[PDB]
From Swiss-Prot, chains A, B:
It comes from the Eukaryota. One of its GO terms (biological process) is positive regulation of vasculogenesis. This is Hypoxia-inducible factor 1-alpha inhibitor. The gene is HIF1AN. Its cofactor is Fe(2+). Substrate binds at D139, Q168, L169, T170, D188, E189, Q190, R225, Q226, A287, N308. Residues 1-38 are annotated as: Disordered. One of its GO terms (cellular component) is nucleoplasm. Its EC number is 1.14.11.30, 1.14.11.n4. Pfam families: Cupin_8. Keywords: Acetylation, Cytoplasm, Dioxygenase, Iron, Metal-binding, Nucleus, Oxidoreductase, Transcription, Transcription regulation. The lineage of its organism: Eukaryota, Metazoa, Chordata, Craniata, Vertebrata. Fe cation binds at H186, D188, H266.
Length: 336, 336
C-alpha cells in the first residue's frame, strides 16, 4: 500500500509513479514476521505472505553487479532478451505443436562481464531493449558466491519444507533484471519462496479460482501456464471475465521473502526507474495429494484435472491441434 | 424409396401417407441378397445394409397376436407405455443425477392376454395411448415358441459373428408394437441385426460423424445416447446443426434383416395405420479394438473418447452436475 520508509531517514523506498497502471483492483498481501503464528497459518493454508525477517538470503544482500562480476567466476550464464518490457518465455519442446508460433524472447550464453557491458550499453543509448539473467546457485559458481550461498538460512527453509510436507527442493535460481522488466501473469505447479535481494519488485498474485478470468493458453501451447490477456491492453471481447479479476499486491524489497503458493497466478515487475533487481527463487515439489480426497474439490485440484484432460486428449487423438474441436463437439448444445 | 409390391398382385406394401414428415434429406440403404459380396463388404466396413433372404427368423413369420398368446405361455411380460407416439425410454439408475427429470414412459408387467386386451381396448376407443412389449427369447417362454426360436438361421448369424470378430450375443429381444410407434433417434454401443417379422417399420440411420448435428444428452443423464432434438418440432436455436443432418432410410418388412452398425444413430417408426409390428433384435458385443491404433481416428472412436471423458470427469468431481461448468471453464476463451 503506502510506500515504506527506508531506515535512516533515507526517504520513501519507492513512489506511485514507478508502478504500472492496470485495470483491476488489488488488496495487500500481509507483511508479517516469520515468528508470527499468522504467517505459519497462511503458508499452511496455501495463501501468500511476505516474511520480513527470515534472513533467508542475508549474505547475498551485499550482491551487486560489481561484487558478482568479480566473484561469480568465468563461466557462461543464460541471458534472456526481450524487445519490449514484457518477457515472453516459451517452451521450445511444444513449438512443434504450433508451427505458426513466433518466439518473442531469445536466450544467449555469455560471460558475466558480457552481461554487465550489454546492460550498461543499453542504458547508455536508452534502447528499451531489456535483459534477464538466470543462473542456478550450485558449485559451478565461484568460491566467494558459494560461501554466500552456504550462508542462506537453510535451517529456516528446511523446517518450512518439513512442516508443510513438501517434496524436494527442485531449483534455486539467481535472477538479475533491469528496471521496468515484467514477467507476465502465469502459474506454476510448485511451491515457491521469492527472496528479494536488490531493488524492488511489485508482485501481483491471483488465486487459482481466477482461472476463468485469466484465460491460460492451451496446455500444448509453448506459452502453457501463461495468461493470454495483455494486461496493458486487455481484449474484453475475447476475455470478458478479465473485467472481474481481483489480485493480491505487494512490493518486496531487500530482505523480504514472498511465499507464492502453488497454482497461484503471479505477475512480477521491476519498478520503473528503480535500478537493477536481484532475486533468488526457491522451488519445491508440492506435498503428495491426500489419499482421502475431500469434496468438493479445491480450485487448484480442478486446474490439475483440466490440465490432465487436455494432455490425455492430445495423446488419444494423436494430434494436440484436434483438442479444441473435439472439446467444442462435446460441449455445444449439450453442456452450454 | 418407391414402395415395393407384395407378391401375388396384393398391391403396394405401403404408401407415402404412412411415413411421418421430417425436415432432413435421406438416401436409401442398400437392399441386397446375403450371398451378394457387396453385402459382406458393407457389414465388414460397418455400414448399414438390408439383407432380404437370410431366413434368419423364418419360423417366426407365422407369429401374430393369436398364435403368440396361445403358445408363449402364462408368464409375465414387460409392457412399456407412452402417452404420445414417441416412446421416451430412460435409465432409472441415472435418475439420481437429475432430480428434476420427469419420466414420460412407464413399464408394467402383465400376462400376454392382458397385453392383447389392453391393445384392443386402446384401438377401440382410439385413445392415442401406445404400447410396446419387450421380451427375451429364452427357455422361459412356451414350448412351441422355443421350437420356433431354435429354428432361426443360427448358422448364418453365427458365421457373421465369427467373420466380423464380434463378441458374444448379448441379447435377443422380441418387440411387439402398435401402428405409429416411434423409438426416437439414439445410438447403441453394440452391433445389431434387426429382423422384421410382421408389419413394416421405417428405419432412419445417421452415421457416427453426425454427432454434432444430433446433440445427445449428457452421459450421466437418464436419456444418455438419445438425441435431444424433437424431430417433430426441431429447436434450431438450441440445435443449429440439426439443419445439416442427412440420414439413411429404408422400410423393412417381413423377412428383411437390417444391420445397424454400432454407434450408428437410428430412428425407428412403425408405419401409420399399418397394424401391429413384430421385430426380433440381436445384439453383439463389438470386436476388440485393434492394438495398433490407426490415425486419424474414426468418428465412433471419437464418440467413445468423449463418453469416457464425461464419465471420468463425473467421478473426479464427485458430482456429475459439475461436468458442464468445468468443461465450459476449460473451453471459454481458450479453445473456442
Ligand atoms: O521474479 C520474476 O520476475 C518472475 N520470474 C518467474 O516467475 C520464473 C523465473 O524467473 C524462472 C523460472 C524458471 C524455473 C526453472 C525451471 C526448470 C529448471 C530450472 C529452473 N520460472 N519458472 C516458473 N516461474 C519462473
Ligand atoms: O425397433 C425399434 O423400434 C427400436 N428399438 C430399439 O432400438 C431398442 C429396443 O427396442 C430395446 C432395447 C433394449 C436392449 C436390452 C438392453 C439390456 C438388456 C436386454 C436388452 N434397446 N437397446 C438399444 N436399443 C434398443
Ligand atoms: Mn513463476
Ligand atoms: Mn437401439
Amino acid at each position: 500500500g503506502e510506500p515504506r520508509e527506508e531506515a535512516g531517514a533515507l526517504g520513501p523506498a519507492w513512489d506511485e509513479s514507478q508502478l504500472r497502471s492496470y485495470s483491476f483492483p488489488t488488496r495487500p498481501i500481509p507483511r508479517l514476521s516469520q515468528s508470527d503464528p499468522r504467517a505459519e497459518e497462511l503458508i499452511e493454508n496455501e495463501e501468500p505472505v511476505v516474511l520480513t525477517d527470515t534472513n533467508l538470503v542475508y549474505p547475498a544482500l551485499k550482491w551487486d553487479l560489481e561484487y558478482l562480476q568479480e566473484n561469480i567466476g568465468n563461466g557462461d550464464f543464460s541471458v534472456y532478451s526481450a524487445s519490449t518490457h514484457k518477457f515472453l518465455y516459451y517452451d521450445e519442446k511444444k513449438m512443434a505443436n504450433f508451427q505458426n508460433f513466433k518466439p518473442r524472447s531469445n536466450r544467449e550464453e555469455m560471460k558475466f562481464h558480457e552481461f554487465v557491458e550489454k546492460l550498461q550499453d543499453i542504458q547508455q543509448r536508452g534502447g528499451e531493449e531489456r535483459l534477464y539473467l538466470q543462473q542456478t546457485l550450485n558449485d559451478t559458481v565461484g568460491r566467494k558466491i558459494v560461501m554466500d550461498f552456504l550462508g542462506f538460512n537453510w535451517n529456516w527453509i528446511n523446517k518450512q519444507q518439513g512442516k508443510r510436507g513438501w517434496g524436494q527442493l527442485t531449483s534455486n535460481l539467481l535472477l538479475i533484471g533491469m528496471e521496468g522488466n515484467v514477467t507476465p501473469a502465469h502459474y506454476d505447479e510448485q511451491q515457491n519462496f521469492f527472496a528479494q535481494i536488490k531493488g524492488y519488485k511489485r508482485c501481483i498474485l491471483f488465486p487459482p479460482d481466477q482461472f476463468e478470468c485469466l484465460y491460460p493458453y492451451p496446455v500444448h501451447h509453448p506459452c502453457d501456464r501463461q495468461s493470454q490477456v495483455d494486461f496493458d491492453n486487455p481484449d474484453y471481447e475475447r476475455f470478458p471475465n478479465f473485467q472481474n479479476v481481483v489480485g493480491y499486491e505487494t512490493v518486496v524489497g531487500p530482505g523480504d521473502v514472498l511465499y507464492i503458493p502453488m497454482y497461484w497466478w503471479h505477475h512480477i515487475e521491476s519498478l520503473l526507474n528503480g535500478g537493477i533487481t536481484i532475486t533468488v527463487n526457491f522451488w519445491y515439489k508440492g506435498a503428495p495429494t491426500p489419499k482421502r480426497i475431500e469434496y468438493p474439490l479445491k480450485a487448484h485440484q480442478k486446474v490439475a484435472i483440466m490440465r490432465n484432460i487436455e494432455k490425455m486428449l492430445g495423446e488419444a487423438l494423436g494430434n494436440p491441434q484436434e483438442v479444441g474441436p473435439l472439446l467444442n463437439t462435446m460441449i455445444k448444445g449439450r453442456y452450454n
